[PDB]
Amino acid sequence: LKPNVKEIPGPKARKVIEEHHKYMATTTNDPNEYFLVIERAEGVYWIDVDGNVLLDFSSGIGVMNVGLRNPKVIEAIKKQLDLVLHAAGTDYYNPYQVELAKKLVEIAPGDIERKVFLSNSGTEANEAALKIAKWSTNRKMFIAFIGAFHGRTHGTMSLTASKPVQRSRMFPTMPGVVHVPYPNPYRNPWGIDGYENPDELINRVIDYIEEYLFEHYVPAEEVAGIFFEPIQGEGGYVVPPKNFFKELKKLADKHGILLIDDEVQMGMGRTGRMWAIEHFDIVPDIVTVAKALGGGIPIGATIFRADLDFGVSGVHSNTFGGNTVAAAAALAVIEELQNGLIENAQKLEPLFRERLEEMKEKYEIIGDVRGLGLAWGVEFVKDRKTKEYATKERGEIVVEALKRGLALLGCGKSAIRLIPPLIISEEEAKMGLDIFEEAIKVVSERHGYKIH
Amino acid sequence: LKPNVKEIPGPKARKVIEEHHKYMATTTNDPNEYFLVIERAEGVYWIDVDGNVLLDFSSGIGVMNVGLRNPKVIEAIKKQLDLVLHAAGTDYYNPYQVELAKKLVEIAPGDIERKVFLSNSGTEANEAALKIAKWSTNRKMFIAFIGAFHGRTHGTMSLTASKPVQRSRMFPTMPGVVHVPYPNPYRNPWGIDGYENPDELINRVIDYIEEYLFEHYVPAEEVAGIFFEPIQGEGGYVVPPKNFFKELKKLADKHGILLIDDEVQMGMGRTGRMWAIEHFDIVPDIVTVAKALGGGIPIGATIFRADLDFGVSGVHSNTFGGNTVAAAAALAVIEELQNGLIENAQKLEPLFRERLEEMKEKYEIIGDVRGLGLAWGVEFVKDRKTKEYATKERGEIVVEALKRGLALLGCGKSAIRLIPPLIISEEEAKMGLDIFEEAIKVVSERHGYKIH
Amino acid sequence: LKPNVKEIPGPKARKVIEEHHKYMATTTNDPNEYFLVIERAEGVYWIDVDGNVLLDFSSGIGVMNVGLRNPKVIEAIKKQLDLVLHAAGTDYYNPYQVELAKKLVEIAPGDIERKVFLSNSGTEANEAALKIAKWSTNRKMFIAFIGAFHGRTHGTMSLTASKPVQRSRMFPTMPGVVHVPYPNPYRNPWGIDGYENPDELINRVIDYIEEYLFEHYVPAEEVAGIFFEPIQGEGGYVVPPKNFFKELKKLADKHGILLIDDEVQMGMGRTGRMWAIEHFDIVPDIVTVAKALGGGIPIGATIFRADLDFGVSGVHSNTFGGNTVAAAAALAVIEELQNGLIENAQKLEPLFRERLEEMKEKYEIIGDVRGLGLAWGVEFVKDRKTKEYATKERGEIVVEALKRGLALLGCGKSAIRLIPPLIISEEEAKMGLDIFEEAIKVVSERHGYKIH
Amino acid sequence: LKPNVKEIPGPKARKVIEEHHKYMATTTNDPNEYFLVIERAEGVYWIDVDGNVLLDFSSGIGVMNVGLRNPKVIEAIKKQLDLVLHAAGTDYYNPYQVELAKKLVEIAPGDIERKVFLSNSGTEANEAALKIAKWSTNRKMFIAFIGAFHGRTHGTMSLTASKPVQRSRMFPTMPGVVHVPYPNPYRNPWGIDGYENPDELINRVIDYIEEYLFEHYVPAEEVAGIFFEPIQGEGGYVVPPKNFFKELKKLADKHGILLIDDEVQMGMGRTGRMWAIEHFDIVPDIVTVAKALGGGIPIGATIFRADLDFGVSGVHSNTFGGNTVAAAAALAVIEELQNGLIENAQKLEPLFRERLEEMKEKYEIIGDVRGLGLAWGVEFVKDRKTKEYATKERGEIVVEALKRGLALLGCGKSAIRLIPPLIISEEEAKMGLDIFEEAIKVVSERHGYKIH
Numbered sequence A, B, C, D: 001l002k003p004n005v006k007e008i009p010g011p012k013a014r015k016v017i018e019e020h021h022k023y024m025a026t027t028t029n030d031p032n033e034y035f036l037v038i039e040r041a042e043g044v045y046w047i048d049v050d051g052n053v054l055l056d057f058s059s060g061i062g063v064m065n066v067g068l069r070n071p072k073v074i075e076a077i078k079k080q081l082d083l084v085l086h087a088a089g090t091d092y093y094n095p096y097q098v099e100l101a102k103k104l105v106e107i108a109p110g111d112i113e114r115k116v117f118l119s120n121s122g123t124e125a126n127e128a129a130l131k132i133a134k135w136s137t138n139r140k141m142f143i144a145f146i147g148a149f150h151g152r153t154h155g156t157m158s159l160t161a162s163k164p165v166q167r168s169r170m171f172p173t174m175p176g177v178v179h180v181p182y183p184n185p186y187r188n189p190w191g192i193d194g195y196e197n198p199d200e201l202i203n204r205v206i207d208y209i210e211e212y213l214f215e216h217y218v219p220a221e222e223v224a225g226i227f228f229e230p231i232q233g234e235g236g237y238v239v240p241p242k243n244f245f246k247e248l249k250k251l252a253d254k255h256g257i258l259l260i261d262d263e264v265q266m267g268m269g270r271t272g273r274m275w276a277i278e279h280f281d282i283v284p285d286i287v288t289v290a291k292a293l294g295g296g297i298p299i300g301a302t303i304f305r306a307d308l309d310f311g312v313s314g315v316h317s318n319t320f321g322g323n324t325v326a327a328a329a330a331l332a333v334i335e336e337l338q339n340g341l342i343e344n345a346q347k348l349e350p351l352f353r354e355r356l357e358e359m360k361e362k363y364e365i366i367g368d369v370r371g372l373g374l375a376w377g378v379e380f381v382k383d384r385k386t387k388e389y390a391t392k393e394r395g396e397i398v399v400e401a402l403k404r405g406l407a408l409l410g411c412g413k414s415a416i417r418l419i420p421p422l423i424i425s426e427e428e429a430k431m432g433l434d435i436f437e438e439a440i441k442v443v444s445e446r447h448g449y450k451i452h
Ligand SMILES: NCCC[C@H](N)C(=O)O
Pocket: A028, A061, A149, A152, A234, A265, B090, B091, B316, B317, B318, B319
């Protein structure tokens, strides 16, 4: 298998897209920018319904970290199918869900007392985090960051602050969430270069919470939790300054506020550590995970300080939580990560840094590149001084990559995320970066952007 | 296989239960009333980790309708694992999710045009219903019924009114939900026998909404939706009067209010129709399903009138939605249902009605039996006049059934649900009802309840 | 002065009404049902701008208890205008507000220690009660009754459940209020005659709270307070059964819930006790008063158990609170009340009961008469069996009374309130009841209602 | 009368303070910083209960703009007392309330169609503004400014963002308010000197609303209104840049958002214009007023664009609104303002600017002085570089002014407001500024602050 694309979308792709439009609700599907219609998958490749072969830099939005069709994950699933699929994890007991909980407790950041609540998705895991924090602190308010993405349920829609269309006609959602600027080193209300001056940007974000919220309208004692992504995902693959979470933890600790680390996108080895928060040297009170945990099967986990546990039975539960097929898949995922995929993300890191810095030097349309491990963000701007979003052009780069056999996803208003499966070879990575560079070059030439 | 129980919980079960309490959050597991630790399943039987063999009358809380471990569903999953697992159904397209959406549209109640939003759970399917209703109507309030269960997320916790511990320290959840009494023919605020006088009970509930809410504090024009279970599940397997939903729909239509039918527990053939609402001759605007749809793989679906679609992209989305493995499972489930399992529910309905009415005649501790298809509730009371809940006795009956190789679940404060897989034979069903009756006899004799 | 009416509304009245509609917001003024344009007042009489003279049975919606224009109250105001008007009672101190606070503490129901928060209105007094209850209990939910009126501010609009137009497009107001049926002995969801069977109605309301709210969706421990009117005013002058509040207090005490008695309309001597709750033999935790307290100057007061005080400065405050002119007026009002006006209410109670029961015997259009002291409600119905509201007829009776020189107000959907100033003579009262009866006779004859 | 103070608090003052503490709720009274106990008032002087005479620079928190005891206001009141006090302004009509509404429509900023809703206080007037805006736009969200003060009711507590103690245990209040930094030229999150660079600070506040809120989590189309004070009062007498409201109006107009101008403290001539918004050259959609409007009698008004009017009767109302004593007082207040008090505020302005700039040059403890007309703020800091709040010292300056016969109020964390009645003479103003300078000098010497 190698990238090989003729007509896309082909006739079979166009037929499915038409049928999708007829029977399915309008969500985030784009017939003009995302015309990929997947039929099957092999190693790091998609094969679409017309036989087109595409190199995967999407991981299906950071879910297929261990590969598009991991054989070790599939064996575990088939083995679990011969035993039981659903055991009603929350009314009856089963050993598969308990074996996963024991492993998640062990691999949790830091070395503190942990328990786990299992669910079916990232948004469920964040909803469970909200409930654990409310119950354990008896506090009802939360702080979240502008640009955040935590899910689309009534609780998590209040935490999410990515695109206003996410909230259109939804008000009122869960009350009690206040938002403050993320320490985005490329775009922040202070105009601070947070790469050159990380401490200045850290102090402005901390000062905003302390002076602007705590000293005026948000009683610090009534805040249950601060929710954060350790790198903002949907918001643009935004990597905050290295010392930010240490300063955030000093502020939270002074007021008895929990730190809630959303690893739904950046966890499960994506940054060359089991958790992205590991690069920032703090131990969050709650960690939420989903997506890559189940290696393609729906699963969520909320890993929390043990003493936060619900005092009584029946405060939270679900039907599908502790799903044995999901539990089997996740145990197989974690062993793959620990046996070389995390190390492979650390090894590939400098290839991604070097090539993307080379692309920033050469192509003016690139405002910023940023990343850790195999989580990389490239933001496109009309002008490096105004930083006006190159949204049209970003979309065209994705489309040109597809035509050349590379599957990419946009993030934020004008960025692209590069998130290839952690099984990707050096040679597969170089090929995808070369195709990515060609798509930028094409759209740069087509719009007259400087090429140095 | 036959019901065969020695010590339960056995030594391997006790080890799992202790590990569960150590590593996992406190939810709805009960070491005292539900000490069932499942290792595998075969036909209508659980095999626990100590080799005990139990006849299943739980169906994993109404999820395993097509049997504890269906070969057609397993075959379809294995076939799907060969092609792909996750294709990012909400960014990219794939034919598998579209095939399921088309089928759900076709089997939806009534003959109006529909679309589908796919999710991972019942609570997600109901959160999507909230969002669809708010967007499409531009109204923000909802009516739900006392005793309802719709899920534990911030939006669905406001809809749910089953047990107050479900809300403990969670206020505020999503504002805007008002609750009114369910037309429960055994227990209602008016003292009405809703079996003997159904129209009187219907009329009291309808008049409570019109006279008490609409004419006093709830502007009818601001209500987006009325959420209902067609039989309350977690609330006690409560079957409302046959004409109630017709009268509810007249009131809703008068005010432009949507009807949202929660079929998460009563759907997928349980009541001897594909949808439980089909017994009540209305066409709801929105139908939610989960649990049984995936035959053991987590899935949810929100089926709605096509003109309620989100008019713009990015209002609602999910990661795992349109999961290809769940979709393959769901199409298999629907084929099995349409090709014989629903007919089986229809055939065994009279055996349950006959056996449960005989038990009610013989055992004074039984206050009420009610049901449709293979959905049966039996409610235990201390005295048939007071209808004082026999909560302790109900728990003792579940334990005595389990010791004798029958897995039952409680529902409401003093009821038991009988929900065996729809593949159950007449002989297997008779074996179950016999054990259930032996358990009732034992607990009656212990406490001095009359046996006629 | 005697009732004397020629044209109403006369030419000067019509000019004022037209100017009102041009310059002022649309509220609860009614050019068709309430065309009374007041120029001055003398004793128990309004003199309108065209010189019409009307006997007042309105008391300015229960504000002018001490008479339409009391000389002792006017003397005290004039004396206070000589010294000071506003002294900023919440930053600086003054002896006038303190003298009133001391008096209110002394005349509060029961013999427990109290403190007082002074405000400008009934809605302010009730918003202060919400804040006192939330702070002192650290709980956030409230129970209120269907038919209640507590004010139109964002906190009190959630408590109020009188007419849905009061809430139109205002959602969301303050979250956390659940409503249950009032023990209205004439109209209730159970169809109970609460006059003949008061304990049955009490028991249904108490059981609705315990069984339907506490045992299903409202955690009793999270309820800060139960708000009630001791007689519902705007809801129809509805007198609940004499033992209801005693049973309500048992339920509240069991759960640590405060009792908040809204006396804004029924206090200051109206019912022939200083507080209407004194008829029902309980000591509420919080009492709110306004309207009549100031004898025509805006004032409100929130009287509470001293141990509910805000433990810290700056939680609640106001500008005009402890206004010295209002305080001087209020002390005068309380002296007049204690020195004869409350005795007058006691003396005239039997004349109202006798005359209104005679009217109920004679006029079939009257469904119900109810009252205490000088607080009387008469409810008009199309048919004594259906109790269909005679809303049009009720409005016609108010208009026919006005044409004959009696000012009445509607209450609820088809009732009239009789609330004459407490200085009214037996002769003046008889003149009023005679005009009221003539108005009922006229509207009965017009529509063919039986006259026995 | 001249400032003459011996012992303060004297024995009679100490007795009232003790009694206040016994019978009245803990609010914003300070026995240690505000020991003034007012007995009567004359011209611009308080006389306390021990015969101490103090020059008034407080106006009783901006209420006594026309004087402590205006004779023209008192005559109007006594004249209205001979006619009627309360006419039930919202059920019946009266010419006094209509004459006030007609005058408020006329004096409203700009020349656009207006109507008026009358209430009893600033917080009621702001609550009415929230309801008018919600009803007229059918939008439920609001933007308010950090540092804002709009009242302590459930609606206005959401708008208020001055001290977190104002909200202690009150959550949840009315949902839907988002807060952004005020353009405070002395203290803002960008560290911008807004005196030297007003356009830079304006653009940062506008950009924060547009880029940070509108482009991320606050759909601009769902915002009913932006609430602002034209000078922040309780927050510190903060005067925004001259062009700020023109830029705010361009932003609001682009999205159909209302501008709601809170003049409860800065209106009724205080800044040498009838309204403070007049200095900023925009025409707000809604204007709220109270305090000084009633010249010492409780009153509120909400003046709004006529087409916003409530479409139906019964959405908003009150009992005491249109109170004829209040209406008479307010008509007399407005005539005093228009006949020379507003002009007197313009005349005294440069005396206040010159003396306070002289004090800033001389006393290092002064960080900032700012003001318009007779509204002036002096902010005290420990260090002019850190701007650390000199809260202890601010309180001591107030106390030393009192001992020397000047009544001052603190504002914000370390400011003092100078708000003398608009009837103050040049000679009275110089005397109060000389006493104010002596109090600063004393506390400067006492703490070692530089005196240049
Ligand atoms: N993982 C976050 C984004 C995934 C999905 N397309 C959504 O927008 O919900």
